[PDB]
Design a protein around this ligand. Structure first.
Ligand SMILES: O=C(C1CCC1)N1C[C@@H]2C[C@H]3C[C@@H](O)[C@@H](O)[C@]2(C1)O3
Length: 130
């Protein structure tokens, strides 16, 4: 229905605004672009599904997310990719891991404060009907 297409349009507006707020935070610069294949040729042998905030915006605009739960699966993949590639005790790996945990926690805290639970449940029930 047109009412259902208006629901998904409001979801995309909400997701673009959360993603912009994460992308402008200086802590999260390292997550705003893909890990570059030239500079790190090893990366794509270890990490089988790369993800970053530029790819997330492109996915919003391609209508890949019908719920906030499917958006948070990609924010969780950004964070778990960084924990698995950079697991060592040295300061450069510990700094990346602390930033990855902060990007995940910050996304979940904005959603807990600003997403209406009945709006999410509506998106879930339209998705489950299709
Ligand atoms: O995992 C990441 C991203 C950082 C947030 C996630 N990288 C892997 C490389 C290791 C480290 C040092 C450079 O080699 C640079 O390319 C990366 C980027 O930083």
């Amino acid at each position: 229905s047109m009412q259902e297409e208006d629901t998904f349009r409001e979801l995309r507006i909400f997701l673009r605004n959360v993603t912009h707020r994460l992308a402008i935070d200086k802590r999260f610069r390292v997550f705003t672009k893909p890990v570059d294949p030239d500079e790190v040729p090893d990366y794509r042998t270890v990490i089988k599904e790369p993800m970053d905030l530029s790819s997330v915006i492109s996915k919003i605009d391609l209508h890949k997310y019908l719920t906030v739960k499917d958006y948070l699966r990609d924010i969780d993949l950004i964070c778990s990719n960084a924990l698995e590639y950079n697991p060592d005790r040295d300061p450069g790996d510990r700094l990346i891991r602390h930033r990855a945990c902060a990007l995940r926690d910050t996304a979940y805290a904005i959603i807990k404060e600003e997403l209406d639970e009945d709006f999410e449940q509506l998106c879930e029930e339209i998705q489950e009907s299709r």
